Design a protein around this motif. Structure first.
Motif, PDB file in Angstrom:
ATOM      1  N   UNK A  29      -5.721 -11.055 -16.910  1.00  0.00           N
ATOM      2  CA  UNK A  29      -4.405 -10.451 -17.088  1.00  0.00           C
ATOM      3  C   UNK A  29      -3.876  -9.900 -15.768  1.00  0.00           C
ATOM      4  N   UNK A  30      -2.758 -10.451 -15.308  1.00  0.00           N
ATOM      5  CA  UNK A  30      -2.151 -10.018 -14.054  1.00  0.00           C
ATOM      6  C   UNK A  30      -1.648  -8.582 -14.163  1.00  0.00           C
ATOM      7  N   UNK A  31      -2.362  -7.662 -13.522  1.00  0.00           N
ATOM      8  CA  UNK A  31      -1.989  -6.253 -13.544  1.00  0.00           C
ATOM      9  C   UNK A  31      -1.298  -5.847 -12.247  1.00  0.00           C
ATOM     10  N   UNK A  32      -0.394  -4.877 -12.343  1.00  0.00           N
ATOM     11  CA  UNK A  32       0.338  -4.397 -11.177  1.00  0.00           C
ATOM     12  C   UNK A  32       0.144  -2.895 -10.994  1.00  0.00           C
ATOM     13  N   UNK A  33      -0.124  -2.485  -9.758  1.00  0.00           N
ATOM     14  CA  UNK A  33      -0.333  -1.074  -9.451  1.00  0.00           C
ATOM     15  C   UNK A  33       0.915  -0.466  -8.817  1.00  0.00           C
ATOM     16  N   UNK A  34       1.223   0.769  -9.198  1.00  0.00           N
ATOM     17  CA  UNK A  34       2.391   1.464  -8.668  1.00  0.00           C
ATOM     18  C   UNK A  34       1.993   2.419  -7.547  1.00  0.00           C
ATOM     19  N   UNK A  35       2.976   2.802  -6.718  1.00  0.00           N
ATOM     20  CA  UNK A  35       2.753   3.717  -5.595  1.00  0.00           C
ATOM     21  C   UNK A  35       2.455   5.140  -6.058  1.00  0.00           C
ATOM     22  N   UNK A  36       2.297   5.311  -7.366  1.00  0.00           N
ATOM     23  CA  UNK A  36       2.008   6.621  -7.937  1.00  0.00           C
ATOM     24  C   UNK A  36       0.617   6.646  -8.563  1.00  0.00           C
ATOM     25  N   UNK A  37      -0.172   5.614  -8.281  1.00  0.00           N
ATOM     26  CA  UNK A  37      -1.525   5.518  -8.817  1.00  0.00           C
ATOM     27  C   UNK A  37      -1.499   5.149 -10.297  1.00  0.00           C
ATOM     28  N   UNK A  38      -0.491   4.379 -10.692  1.00  0.00           N
ATOM     29  CA  UNK A  38      -0.351   3.954 -12.080  1.00  0.00           C
ATOM     30  C   UNK A  38      -0.244   2.435 -12.176  1.00  0.00           C
ATOM     31  N   UNK A  39      -1.106   1.836 -12.991  1.00  0.00           N
ATOM     32  CA  UNK A  39      -1.109   0.388 -13.171  1.00  0.00           C
ATOM     33  C   UNK A  39      -0.332  -0.006 -14.424  1.00  0.00           C
ATOM     34  N   UNK A  40       0.125  -1.253 -14.461  1.00  0.00           N
ATOM     35  CA  UNK A  40       0.881  -1.756 -15.603  1.00  0.00           C
ATOM     36  C   UNK A  40       0.836  -3.280 -15.656  1.00  0.00           C
ATOM     37  N   UNK A  58       5.621   8.311 -15.075  1.00  0.00           N
ATOM     38  CA  UNK A  58       6.044   9.468 -14.295  1.00  0.00           C
ATOM     39  C   UNK A  58       7.401   9.218 -13.643  1.00  0.00           C
ATOM     40  N   UNK A  59       7.842   7.964 -13.672  1.00  0.00           N
ATOM     41  CA  UNK A  59       9.122   7.592 -13.082  1.00  0.00           C
ATOM     42  C   UNK A  59       9.194   8.021 -11.620  1.00  0.00           C
ATOM     43  N   UNK A  60       8.135   7.731 -10.871  1.00  0.00           N
ATOM     44  CA  UNK A  60       8.075   8.085  -9.458  1.00  0.00           C
ATOM     45  C   UNK A  60       8.965   7.165  -8.629  1.00  0.00           C
ATOM     46  N   UNK A  61      10.065   7.712  -8.120  1.00  0.00           N
ATOM     47  CA  UNK A  61      11.000   6.939  -7.311  1.00  0.00           C
ATOM     48  C   UNK A  61      10.258   5.935  -6.434  1.00  0.00           C
ATOM     49  N   UNK A  62      10.439   4.653  -6.730  1.00  0.00           N
ATOM     50  CA  UNK A  62       9.788   3.592  -5.968  1.00  0.00           C
ATOM     51  C   UNK A  62      10.663   3.142  -4.803  1.00  0.00           C
ATOM     52  N   UNK A  63      11.335   4.099  -4.170  1.00  0.00           N
ATOM     53  CA  UNK A  63      12.204   3.801  -3.039  1.00  0.00           C
ATOM     54  C   UNK A  63      12.437   5.041  -2.184  1.00  0.00           C
ATOM     55  N   UNK A  64      12.533   4.841  -0.872  1.00  0.00           N
ATOM     56  CA  UNK A  64      12.756   5.952   0.034  1.00  0.00           C
ATOM     57  C   UNK A  64      13.931   5.717   0.962  1.00  0.00           C
TER      58      UNK A  64
END
Ligand SMILES: [Zn+2]
Ligand SMILES: [Zn+2]
Length: 78
Positions: A29-40, A58-64
């Motif tokens: 299963x292709x899993x994806x990790x977020x910049x907030x330490x959360x996988x999906x 957590x809806x951690x803004x994935x943009x700066x």
């Protein structure tokens, strides 16, 4: 008596089940990790970020950088 252990590796299968569906992961299963330490799930987040562009947990803004950023898909998208 009972002697044995494995541990808790980053991604081994410990309460890491995808939050989107709250089911579970899979080696294949292709899993994806977020910049907030959360996988999906690559099938649960993909269609998510392309709509919210954030973490469904957590809806951690994935943009700066400035707002001007590559779109999730095509204008059509909601
Ligand atoms: Zn999922
Ligand atoms: Zn998160």
């Amino acid at each position: 008596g009972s002697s044995g252990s494995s541990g808790t590796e980053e991604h081994v299968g410990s309460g890491l089940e995808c939050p989107v569906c709250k089911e579970d992961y899979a080696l294949g299963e292709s899993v994806r990790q977020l910049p907030c330490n959360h996988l999906f799930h690559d099938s649960c987040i993909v269609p998510w970020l392309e709509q919210h562009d954030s973490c469904p947990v957590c809806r951690k803004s994935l943009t700066g950088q400035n707002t001007a950023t590559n779109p999730p898909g095509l204008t059509g998208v909601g």
